[PDB]
């Protein structure tokens, strides 16, 4: 989140909003996985 690029279709900051740390998860197979999503503006039910 160094900056939202001036041309919005190419701004990577938007997708990092609210993301302050990731979570890692390692399985028995020896495959490591990392991700996180954060979002507050919502309502009781979602289309997705």
């Amino acid at each position: 989140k160094k900056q939202s690029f001036v041309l919005s279709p190419f701004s990577t900051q938007e997708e990092m909003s609210g993301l302050s740390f990731h979570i890692a998860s390692l399985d028995e197979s020896g495959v490591l996985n990392v991700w996180v999503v954060v979002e507050l503006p919502k309502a009781d039910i979602a289309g997705s």
């Binding site: 160094k2 690029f5 041309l7 279709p9 190419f10 990577t12 997708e15 990092m16």
Partner: protein, 96 residues
């Protein structure tokens, strides 16, 4: 001067491309950080105040540059396709 000018043009193109990848740092973080230091000893084959009297050495450095930076281009190419194709055929946004 012609060879000296081209030398700087190559440097500018390399630095410019890197800065463009930097804007997409969340896309190619691993490549950008690692490749920076991989390419440093490559650049060291064409130092400041360069004279093309061992130019073949630099040619080898450039050949590796092109072959090693490619993972960065592939990941960014994917991002660009999504970001451009998302544009709903608006000539204005497309051109920009």
């Amino acid at each position: 001067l012609d060879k000296l000018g081209k030398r700087l043009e190559e440097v500018l193109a390399i630095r410019t491309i890197h800065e463009k990848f930097l804007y997409f740092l969340p896309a190619s973080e691993e490549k950008i950080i690692c490749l920076t230091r991989v390419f440093e000893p490559f650049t060291g084959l064409n130092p400041v105040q360069y004279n093309p009297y061992t130019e073949p050495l630099w040619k080898a450095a450039v050949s590796q540059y092109e072959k090693i930076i490619a993972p960065a281009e592939q990941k960014i190419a994917g991002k660009l396709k999504n970001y451009i194709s998302e544009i709903q055929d608006s000539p204005q946004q497309l051109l920009q």
